């Protein structure tokens, strides 16, 4: 069992520290198994060996863990990364001076799967943000430059790595504890920088929202940065996609522009509508409509404490659309524009599939009726799409 | 024949299928002879760092086959009168480029274990396993510096040399079988030549070599305390020859060889230790060489001499 | 809202080592006229009509683009909104042609790049002088950043000293011995009396035997712009020493010169480095503006801090406080300058 | 044969004996032996000219009792 | 480490010093003068004005500069300190080395002696100071070989001088720290440190009861110190350059000083203005030793960087101009070899010495060939030129003033030459290939019984002179074992050789194993009108016959001319020399062939 090894490393550490290189070699050898019990045993062997021994053996431990991480096999990578995470949360001060070795992993970012990169950035960030480091905070201000030089790159893969790292570091930097200080302003500056950098490419733009809206949900963050990001995201989404309903007509398209799938048929009493058709026609930005709304909703619900009364007209809003029903223009005119119609139906169905996810927790009866009608609309669209 | 170094940029970012990369690596194999000897290691580095996301068996197989063929040709046409004679690239260049390339391949294998597993499964042996060569033996001996592959390559080498000595003992025992086939270089002389060739200032194979010698000696020692004894005796003789050969050439390792032999021979277990004793007597023939490097292990061996029994 | 009328150079890939060097070099008071006059001779030479003959014109092209863009912003502030910068492209391409080891997008040292471009401009000016003599401003680097070194060595047994003159372009200086260390101690570690002992001996020729020797350094001829170069690293596998030594603003060098001197070497430029490892980093410059509309005169005598594209004025006392080793300045100084005031 | 000085990284002075027929890489190997720095991080600056792996000592007009300051390369960018 | 073999080319007896003299000791009971030579030999001279040839004997065991000597034990024993890092104890009457102390780790620079305790101490550039009871050292035998030490600590830098007083109660050291540091030798406790002097101190003296001290310094001053007051009570600046040597009379009232400026003064300590110019020597004065038979000393002996030693007479003290102009006795010295050039055959050497005499030597036979007189040295080099290349296989050093040849494993066997190009005939009509270093190794160990095989003694082509000293040392410093060539048959010498001769010499001298050959790759192409390789000694003729055959003796030579870099090659010239002298490009040598 493990309390046996606990007693072993607690009582006889002074004699056992003589041959710690052999201990580390044995742990490295037995970590290469397939089951989970042996791997966990070797993991805790590394942990306890780092806990009690001399600083040189600690350097040897972190070197062995680094070469384990850069080895390549998935189970070894996950196990070693988890070991490093629990080791740095256990004894941050001893691990602090050995940050060079763990940072040196960042040169090898082709042997690591995309999911483990987030964990690596997480463990490095929580290493570099303990208040014992505030005496000489060098790792933090080095990583704020590493992220910048990653984002300003031209290779797409490093740009994606940069956005992942920037989001997962800003999350720890603005972490909610038991602040509202200049660190929040730095968090805001980092976020607007990484928004300006990755605003152009849409495939690289969707990842930013799909990481930020996960971080702002599973973890939490302090009310000040929350307030600022909520204000700017609400302003930006209100300015960007929202087109007033009373000015619905606009020309220059081969298809007759119309508004469909509204609720209660108010017929443009006030200005709420989704301008989906012109954006797609110009893209013969709208590709990132699906996650931007999710980020907006989750941010506003966290800012107002589960109160969605602000985004209320964004359930009965209609969508600018052509005559999506097949008017016998399917057998004929089966040109490239047919694929455009397919993508349009796909994207509006995805928007409906997100908007039904948005308002379900609320318990107002007629509002529940609204979301059920939205469900009927998405099922009829999913029927139509096969044509 | 000049832009081939930048010909690799086409396979970096765009995805490909197996047929076209196999065709281009076949072209590369065909032009290995054309380009130059000295330009090879950077090209090997480029192709092998490309190979992680694509073809992995083909490049390693081509490099191994090319260098085995080149070593074979150089060895066959090197023999002759010590005078003016036709020869290709000299030994001092060939051994150096081989050392750089084997070190690069070991590094690349250390970057991803899948290449090493493919290499090990590729050279699997009963069978002749004709792909074995001084270059490939050196490769397998240098991969042992990684903990993942140590036993997995040493057991393969051990079974290979046992199969070779069994083949020799079977072939010498008949006329008909000796009448039909022409002799092939049996792997005993292959390793016995690799150890001699290892003088050319590369030491990353000495540890694998001494470990192989000790494993191969221990596993087939005379345990008498009849047909299978002859391979089991030739194997021990080969192990002693290998150990004594690496003792003289390389300096950094000679302190540990004698320590292991002593630590294995000074026992009260009364196990048969005739071969270890013979090896120790052979390697203390060069008395000053021992005194330069390791004159301490013999001293504490002497201090323990009071406790052992009479024989 | 507030855009500083001082132009930066875009990142343009993984290249900031050249951006910092170029920005800290453009303000060198003698460089701007000379590097244009040399191209002005080149233009008439081409009018009369090479690999080493193109950088010396590319630099002038970059300088005129920089000056023209800065003036264009200056008389028309409405046009430019957020970023006031350009990108060094012809210079980078030419310098790639000059030395192929920068081909790619890796990181690079800054002092080495400065050495390369200075050696190349010296070589091409010397070649132009040779072409002229084959038939006042030809001396640019041989006069600006280069002076003469005087060495001596005293064999303790024979007590006879021999000299050995040398050329120098930068005083490479150690950062710590192996508590704060004044830069005066840092220089006197490099250019003062120390002995050679132990496994290291000086084979004297008057005595025909290995022996203990005492050797020193002397600054005979002083260039127009002296550039201390702090070896802010150490061996042991290697690492960076992020504990900067105290730096003065008015350096006087009467201790180590041979003849008595009355000179005042005042600081006007600093190139820093921001990282914790030898293998990476990000160079930021810092240049005092001192010479060369009245809007510019308001900014005269202040300190700037050039990042790649942005720029922010810092008052001089703030910059001086920013280099004290009382804390970690987060940007280790690496290559100081000193104009001969 | 001749014997030259190399002002080391930290300010000390080391002396090494090389002949004018020696390659620069051989001198860097000598430095590796004397101090322990792998001959990829060296750059021996002499009289403002940086020594390179192609030429030899006699090409640079280096004679007895000269100095070569030793510095590393600090990657940045 | 790595063990080198060396040997010195010289005559069996060097009666006269071949270099300067570092130190002097005068035995008053036997009228014998000891000189410690920079040529590594200590010599004993008679100072009887009777004999015309004062030389008596040489004691040769040291390997490098002898820096200090002290006569101990009422003149029976002298102890010497040398730059080979050892201290040796000699029987001064019979002139042989009895023990070698090896506890120091760098040049030993100074020795000190306390007559009333018969105590000596040694100190050097390694910053260590060891104290030794002489009777414990003399009691040493081959069984009782244990000696135990006592040393002083505190010294921060290399020691250049050292003095003790007669009672052995105060010891002072001088060093580049400029402060002289003082200890009590009886307890090893550190005592006060008197700071004030501003430079190295190469000369130190103490009065009998260790109450006053004189220091001499490279700053040119003499300073008198009271140890009871711990301060300077007078400073004398009588020299222009560094003061290197001090002596004082028994009354401690007149100081004799000398140094780099060659002038020797006698100054009265109580009244400086009364001073006497004793003489101006011909070279910097390094050390002086008074004869003290009578109160106003009759003479002073003077050591310089020159090989001659002058005795100057002292008429008296009571009375710009020198008191004396010619020495009273003169012990003659010999010339030092100061310049050496190895010829292209890598076999003969041209020398120049301090007298501007030029000589020609045979490295292989370890002897001189001819005196060439005072011809111009560089014209003699240019006149003896032969177009041949042979790889370097030894190195020469002149540190002892004689020719010392050193062999190293890295290049000892690099030079194969043909018997014909050497001075070794072909008595069987053919000439095979000899390795020079291997032949030399076999000649040096010719008398070692272990190389004798069943009788051959040597190599069959030449002998070295039997008296040549053969030295086995480690590279950088420590000599391991030194013997004369003829002495190798002894049982003690053979045991120590068996224990000391490295395996790389054993390989050649015992096993009679051939060294590796060297081959040269080269190109052949039709630009005169395939990649091959051959021995570096192959003659062009062999390539010409090769070409003659592959494109089909006397006829071959008549028809085919071989070229390199468009120069016509001498058919007798070998490939190695062509490559060294004619190939001026890079990459492999390229030869062009043609048919005529
Ligand atoms: Zn000298």
Tab-separated table of N, CA and C in Angstrom, chain E residues 96-213:
chain	number	residue	atom	x	y	z
E	96	UNK	N	75.599	12.939	-3.304
E	96	UNK	CA	74.501	12.152	-3.844
E	96	UNK	C	73.213	12.479	-3.103
E	97	UNK	N	72.094	12.308	-3.802
E	97	UNK	CA	70.775	12.627	-3.267
E	97	UNK	C	70.273	11.492	-2.383
E	98	UNK	N	69.825	11.827	-1.176
E	98	UNK	CA	69.385	10.803	-0.237
E	98	UNK	C	67.870	10.677	-0.172
E	99	UNK	N	67.138	11.785	-0.234
E	99	UNK	CA	65.687	11.733	-0.150
E	99	UNK	C	65.108	12.819	-1.040
E	100	UNK	N	63.870	12.613	-1.477
E	100	UNK	CA	63.153	13.605	-2.267
E	100	UNK	C	61.799	13.859	-1.631
E	101	UNK	N	61.565	15.088	-1.182
E	101	UNK	CA	60.261	15.450	-0.654
E	101	UNK	C	59.393	16.010	-1.770
E	102	UNK	N	58.138	15.573	-1.822
E	102	UNK	CA	57.272	15.922	-2.943
E	102	UNK	C	55.950	16.511	-2.467
E	103	UNK	N	55.935	17.117	-1.283
E	103	UNK	CA	54.687	17.629	-0.732
E	103	UNK	C	54.239	18.946	-1.353
E	104	UNK	N	55.143	19.692	-1.974
E	104	UNK	CA	54.799	20.939	-2.637
E	104	UNK	C	54.132	20.656	-3.976
E	105	UNK	N	53.380	21.640	-4.470
E	105	UNK	CA	52.589	21.429	-5.674
E	105	UNK	C	52.877	22.457	-6.758
E	106	UNK	N	53.924	23.260	-6.607
E	106	UNK	CA	54.305	24.242	-7.612
E	106	UNK	C	55.769	24.592	-7.353
E	107	UNK	N	56.302	25.563	-8.098
E	107	UNK	CA	57.693	25.985	-7.924
E	107	UNK	C	57.995	26.351	-6.477
E	108	UNK	N	58.995	25.692	-5.902
E	108	UNK	CA	59.544	26.070	-4.602
E	108	UNK	C	60.569	27.183	-4.781
E	109	UNK	N	60.356	28.310	-4.105
E	109	UNK	CA	61.082	29.535	-4.416
E	109	UNK	C	62.133	29.933	-3.390
E	110	UNK	N	61.984	29.560	-2.120
E	110	UNK	CA	62.859	30.096	-1.086
E	110	UNK	C	63.034	29.063	0.014
E	111	UNK	N	64.228	29.041	0.610
E	111	UNK	CA	64.517	28.178	1.746
E	111	UNK	C	65.047	28.999	2.920
E	112	UNK	N	64.819	28.509	4.141
E	112	UNK	CA	65.254	29.194	5.357
E	112	UNK	C	65.878	28.214	6.345
E	113	UNK	N	66.737	28.734	7.226
E	113	UNK	CA	67.590	27.892	8.063
E	113	UNK	C	67.812	28.565	9.412
E	114	UNK	N	67.548	27.835	10.500
E	114	UNK	CA	67.755	28.302	11.879
E	114	UNK	C	68.821	27.473	12.592
E	115	UNK	N	70.065	27.955	12.554
E	115	UNK	CA	71.216	27.191	13.033
E	115	UNK	C	71.050	26.666	14.460
E	116	UNK	N	70.475	27.468	15.360
E	116	UNK	CA	70.396	27.047	16.758
E	116	UNK	C	69.376	25.948	17.030
E	117	UNK	N	68.461	25.661	16.111
E	117	UNK	CA	67.519	24.570	16.311
E	117	UNK	C	67.772	23.458	15.311
E	118	UNK	N	68.760	23.652	14.443
E	118	UNK	CA	69.002	22.888	13.223
E	118	UNK	C	67.672	22.558	12.544
E	119	UNK	N	66.916	23.621	12.288
E	119	UNK	CA	65.593	23.576	11.681
E	119	UNK	C	65.610	24.259	10.320
E	120	UNK	N	65.007	23.634	9.307
E	120	UNK	CA	64.835	24.330	8.037
E	120	UNK	C	63.360	24.328	7.667
E	121	UNK	N	62.989	25.307	6.846
E	121	UNK	CA	61.637	25.438	6.328
E	121	UNK	C	61.677	25.746	4.843
E	122	UNK	N	60.638	25.326	4.131
E	122	UNK	CA	60.561	25.538	2.697
E	122	UNK	C	59.243	26.211	2.365
E	123	UNK	N	59.265	27.023	1.314
E	123	UNK	CA	58.109	27.806	0.916
E	123	UNK	C	58.215	28.108	-0.566
E	124	UNK	N	57.071	28.171	-1.237
E	124	UNK	CA	57.127	28.516	-2.641
E	124	UNK	C	55.894	29.162	-3.224
E	125	UNK	N	55.830	29.171	-4.554
E	125	UNK	CA	54.768	29.818	-5.314
E	125	UNK	C	53.398	29.187	-5.080
E	126	UNK	N	53.333	28.035	-4.418
E	126	UNK	CA	52.081	27.351	-4.119
E	126	UNK	C	51.410	27.835	-2.839
E	127	UNK	N	51.980	28.847	-2.181
E	127	UNK	CA	51.508	29.502	-0.961
E	127	UNK	C	51.577	28.629	0.283
E	128	UNK	N	52.268	27.500	0.237
E	128	UNK	CA	52.427	26.653	1.408
E	128	UNK	C	53.784	26.917	2.051
E	129	UNK	N	53.847	26.801	3.375
E	129	UNK	CA	55.115	26.868	4.099
E	129	UNK	C	55.203	25.659	5.018
E	130	UNK	N	56.136	24.754	4.740
E	130	UNK	CA	56.369	23.581	5.573
E	130	UNK	C	57.633	23.742	6.401
E	131	UNK	N	57.571	23.277	7.644
E	131	UNK	CA	58.696	23.275	8.567
E	131	UNK	C	59.220	21.852	8.733
E	132	UNK	N	60.541	21.669	8.666
E	132	UNK	CA	61.130	20.333	8.695
E	132	UNK	C	62.290	20.295	9.679
E	133	UNK	N	62.258	19.345	10.611
E	133	UNK	CA	63.415	19.060	11.452
E	133	UNK	C	64.401	18.248	10.614
E	134	UNK	N	65.589	18.805	10.374
E	134	UNK	CA	66.578	18.168	9.501
E	134	UNK	C	66.982	16.775	9.996
E	135	UNK	N	67.144	16.586	11.313
E	135	UNK	CA	67.545	15.275	11.834
E	135	UNK	C	66.495	14.194	11.602
E	136	UNK	N	65.216	14.561	11.574
E	136	UNK	CA	64.192	13.608	11.165
E	136	UNK	C	64.369	13.214	9.705
E	137	UNK	N	64.708	14.173	8.842
E	137	UNK	CA	64.924	13.845	7.437
E	137	UNK	C	66.158	12.965	7.264
E	138	UNK	N	67.246	13.270	7.976
E	138	UNK	CA	68.449	12.460	7.826
E	138	UNK	C	68.267	11.072	8.421
E	139	UNK	N	67.351	10.906	9.379
E	139	UNK	CA	67.133	9.598	9.986
E	139	UNK	C	66.345	8.665	9.077
E	140	UNK	N	65.832	9.183	7.965
E	140	UNK	CA	65.022	8.418	7.029
E	140	UNK	C	65.826	7.300	6.381
E	141	UNK	N	65.202	6.130	6.269
E	141	UNK	CA	65.783	4.994	5.570
E	141	UNK	C	64.700	4.364	4.706
E	142	UNK	N	65.065	3.281	4.021
E	142	UNK	CA	64.129	2.625	3.116
E	142	UNK	C	63.008	1.900	3.845
E	143	UNK	N	63.227	1.472	5.086
E	143	UNK	CA	62.108	0.964	5.874
E	143	UNK	C	61.369	2.055	6.648
E	144	UNK	N	62.081	2.803	7.489
E	144	UNK	CA	61.488	3.941	8.185
E	144	UNK	C	61.230	5.175	7.326
E	145	UNK	N	60.264	5.121	6.414
E	145	UNK	CA	60.137	6.161	5.402
E	145	UNK	C	59.088	7.205	5.777
E	146	UNK	N	58.553	7.144	6.994
E	146	UNK	CA	57.467	8.019	7.414
E	146	UNK	C	58.023	9.331	7.951
E	147	UNK	N	57.475	10.431	7.459
E	147	UNK	CA	57.783	11.778	7.914
E	147	UNK	C	56.460	12.490	8.143
E	148	UNK	N	56.427	13.348	9.151
E	148	UNK	CA	55.216	14.075	9.483
E	148	UNK	C	55.542	15.560	9.472
E	149	UNK	N	54.540	16.349	9.106
E	149	UNK	CA	54.715	17.758	8.805
E	149	UNK	C	54.014	18.660	9.804
E	150	UNK	N	54.414	19.920	9.737
E	150	UNK	CA	53.792	21.027	10.435
E	150	UNK	C	53.924	22.198	9.481
E	151	UNK	N	52.828	22.913	9.262
E	151	UNK	CA	52.806	23.977	8.276
E	151	UNK	C	52.077	25.182	8.833
E	152	UNK	N	52.329	26.325	8.210
E	152	UNK	CA	51.731	27.578	8.621
E	152	UNK	C	50.692	27.987	7.590
E	153	UNK	N	49.617	28.604	8.064
E	153	UNK	CA	48.575	29.084	7.178
E	153	UNK	C	48.365	30.577	7.379
E	154	UNK	N	47.773	31.197	6.367
E	154	UNK	CA	47.340	32.575	6.440
E	154	UNK	C	47.749	33.280	5.169
E	155	UNK	N	48.794	32.745	4.547
E	155	UNK	CA	49.385	33.334	3.354
E	155	UNK	C	48.416	33.307	2.175
E	156	UNK	N	48.118	34.481	1.620
E	156	UNK	CA	47.155	34.589	0.532
E	156	UNK	C	47.755	34.551	-0.876
E	157	UNK	N	49.079	34.563	-1.046
E	157	UNK	CA	49.636	34.594	-2.399
E	157	UNK	C	51.011	33.942	-2.480
E	158	UNK	N	51.495	33.832	-3.719
E	158	UNK	CA	52.742	33.145	-4.042
E	158	UNK	C	53.938	33.749	-3.316
E	159	UNK	N	54.739	32.885	-2.699
E	159	UNK	CA	55.875	33.295	-1.882
E	159	UNK	C	57.131	33.389	-2.733
E	160	UNK	N	57.858	34.498	-2.600
E	160	UNK	CA	59.072	34.713	-3.366
E	160	UNK	C	60.320	34.818	-2.511
E	161	UNK	N	60.186	34.956	-1.197
E	161	UNK	CA	61.344	35.053	-0.324
E	161	UNK	C	60.929	34.660	1.082
E	162	UNK	N	61.928	34.409	1.923
E	162	UNK	CA	61.697	33.789	3.221
E	162	UNK	C	62.953	33.882	4.071
E	163	UNK	N	62.821	34.281	5.331
E	163	UNK	CA	63.966	34.304	6.223
E	163	UNK	C	63.520	33.879	7.609
E	164	UNK	N	64.421	33.221	8.326
E	164	UNK	CA	64.272	32.945	9.743
E	164	UNK	C	65.451	33.541	10.503
E	165	UNK	N	65.268	33.801	11.796
E	165	UNK	CA	66.397	34.208	12.623
E	165	UNK	C	67.152	33.011	13.193
E	166	UNK	N	68.337	33.302	13.741
E	166	UNK	CA	69.241	32.256	14.207
E	166	UNK	C	68.652	31.437	15.347
E	167	UNK	N	67.856	32.056	16.220
E	167	UNK	CA	67.273	31.333	17.344
E	167	UNK	C	66.077	30.487	16.952
E	168	UNK	N	65.518	30.710	15.772
E	168	UNK	CA	64.381	29.941	15.315
E	168	UNK	C	63.115	30.220	16.091
E	169	UNK	N	62.873	31.482	16.439
E	169	UNK	CA	61.699	31.875	17.200
E	169	UNK	C	60.763	32.765	16.402
E	170	UNK	N	61.229	33.310	15.287
E	170	UNK	CA	60.452	34.161	14.399
E	170	UNK	C	60.735	33.709	12.976
E	171	UNK	N	59.684	33.594	12.178
E	171	UNK	CA	59.797	33.357	10.749
E	171	UNK	C	58.948	34.396	10.039
E	172	UNK	N	59.473	34.931	8.942
E	172	UNK	CA	58.788	35.948	8.159
E	172	UNK	C	58.786	35.475	6.719
E	173	UNK	N	57.680	35.708	6.038
E	173	UNK	CA	57.572	35.396	4.628
E	173	UNK	C	57.346	36.657	3.813
E	174	UNK	N	57.828	36.635	2.585
E	174	UNK	CA	57.625	37.730	1.652
E	174	UNK	C	56.930	37.239	0.399
E	175	UNK	N	56.033	38.057	-0.135
E	175	UNK	CA	55.196	37.613	-1.239
E	175	UNK	C	54.690	38.822	-2.013
E	176	UNK	N	53.904	38.547	-3.056
E	176	UNK	CA	53.254	39.567	-3.871
E	176	UNK	C	52.094	40.255	-3.163
E	177	UNK	N	51.762	39.859	-1.935
E	177	UNK	CA	50.795	40.599	-1.135
E	177	UNK	C	51.417	41.856	-0.562
E	178	UNK	N	52.741	41.961	-0.676
E	178	UNK	CA	53.611	43.084	-0.352
E	178	UNK	C	53.809	43.162	1.153
E	179	UNK	N	52.758	42.890	1.928
E	179	UNK	CA	52.938	42.708	3.359
E	179	UNK	C	53.809	41.482	3.608
E	180	UNK	N	54.733	41.597	4.550
E	180	UNK	CA	55.439	40.434	5.068
E	180	UNK	C	54.643	39.879	6.242
E	181	UNK	N	54.414	38.572	6.239
E	181	UNK	CA	53.644	37.900	7.276
E	181	UNK	C	54.593	37.121	8.172
E	182	UNK	N	54.361	37.228	9.477
E	182	UNK	CA	55.234	36.695	10.515
E	182	UNK	C	54.499	35.683	11.380
E	183	UNK	N	55.157	34.556	11.655
E	183	UNK	CA	54.619	33.547	12.550
E	183	UNK	C	55.676	33.226	13.596
E	184	UNK	N	55.235	32.624	14.703
E	184	UNK	CA	56.124	31.903	15.605
E	184	UNK	C	56.266	30.474	15.106
E	185	UNK	N	57.451	30.049	14.676
E	185	UNK	CA	57.625	28.657	14.232
E	185	UNK	C	57.444	27.614	15.325
E	186	UNK	N	57.596	27.970	16.603
E	186	UNK	CA	57.467	26.965	17.656
E	186	UNK	C	56.026	26.539	17.894
E	187	UNK	N	55.059	27.427	17.669
E	187	UNK	CA	53.671	27.130	17.984
E	187	UNK	C	52.758	27.161	16.774
E	188	UNK	N	53.248	27.642	15.635
E	188	UNK	CA	52.543	27.883	14.379
E	188	UNK	C	51.443	28.928	14.512
E	189	UNK	N	51.414	29.676	15.613
E	189	UNK	CA	50.393	30.698	15.778
E	189	UNK	C	50.725	31.881	14.888
E	190	UNK	N	49.713	32.441	14.241
E	190	UNK	CA	49.943	33.658	13.480
E	190	UNK	C	50.166	34.862	14.388
E	191	UNK	N	51.196	35.634	14.086
E	191	UNK	CA	51.572	36.845	14.798
E	191	UNK	C	51.172	38.033	13.941
E	192	UNK	N	51.662	39.206	14.325
E	192	UNK	CA	51.252	40.447	13.696
E	192	UNK	C	51.633	40.463	12.213
E	193	UNK	N	51.011	41.379	11.476
E	193	UNK	CA	51.289	41.610	10.064
E	193	UNK	C	51.633	43.077	9.871
E	194	UNK	N	52.848	43.345	9.412
E	194	UNK	CA	53.334	44.705	9.213
E	194	UNK	C	53.140	45.131	7.761
E	195	UNK	N	52.263	46.105	7.552
E	195	UNK	CA	51.883	46.566	6.227
E	195	UNK	C	52.513	47.937	6.031
E	196	UNK	N	52.943	48.221	4.811
E	196	UNK	CA	53.571	49.502	4.571
E	196	UNK	C	54.376	49.501	3.295
E	197	UNK	N	55.008	48.369	3.014
E	197	UNK	CA	55.811	48.223	1.812
E	197	UNK	C	54.849	48.178	0.626
E	198	UNK	N	55.291	48.667	-0.535
E	198	UNK	CA	54.400	48.689	-1.693
E	198	UNK	C	54.743	47.764	-2.859
E	199	UNK	N	55.616	46.776	-2.701
E	199	UNK	CA	55.851	45.891	-3.841
E	199	UNK	C	56.385	44.552	-3.349
E	200	UNK	N	56.618	43.646	-4.307
E	200	UNK	CA	57.211	42.342	-4.036
E	200	UNK	C	58.465	42.487	-3.185
E	201	UNK	N	58.737	41.483	-2.364
E	201	UNK	CA	59.927	41.450	-1.520
E	201	UNK	C	60.718	40.178	-1.799
E	202	UNK	N	61.857	40.323	-2.470
E	202	UNK	CA	62.665	39.180	-2.862
E	202	UNK	C	63.853	38.932	-1.942
E	203	UNK	N	64.059	39.758	-0.918
E	203	UNK	CA	65.208	39.605	-0.033
E	203	UNK	C	64.820	39.932	1.400
E	204	UNK	N	65.105	39.022	2.330
E	204	UNK	CA	64.709	39.211	3.718
E	204	UNK	C	65.834	38.763	4.638
E	205	UNK	N	66.050	39.514	5.719
E	205	UNK	CA	67.023	39.162	6.745
E	205	UNK	C	66.486	39.519	8.123
E	206	UNK	N	66.844	38.705	9.114
E	206	UNK	CA	66.526	38.960	10.513
E	206	UNK	C	67.793	38.947	11.351
E	207	UNK	N	67.833	39.810	12.361
E	207	UNK	CA	68.908	39.775	13.337
E	207	UNK	C	68.758	38.520	14.202
E	208	UNK	N	69.776	38.261	15.029
E	208	UNK	CA	69.903	36.970	15.701
E	208	UNK	C	68.724	36.683	16.621
E	209	UNK	N	68.242	37.694	17.339
E	209	UNK	CA	67.130	37.513	18.257
E	209	UNK	C	65.798	37.961	17.674
E	210	UNK	N	65.695	38.047	16.352
E	210	UNK	CA	64.422	38.302	15.692
E	210	UNK	C	63.743	39.566	16.172
E	211	UNK	N	64.524	40.619	16.414
E	211	UNK	CA	63.993	41.914	16.801
E	211	UNK	C	64.052	42.948	15.697
E	212	UNK	N	64.898	42.757	14.694
E	212	UNK	CA	64.930	43.655	13.558
E	212	UNK	C	64.818	42.853	12.273
E	213	UNK	N	64.279	43.490	11.239
E	213	UNK	CA	64.107	42.849	9.946
E	213	UNK	C	64.517	43.811	8.847
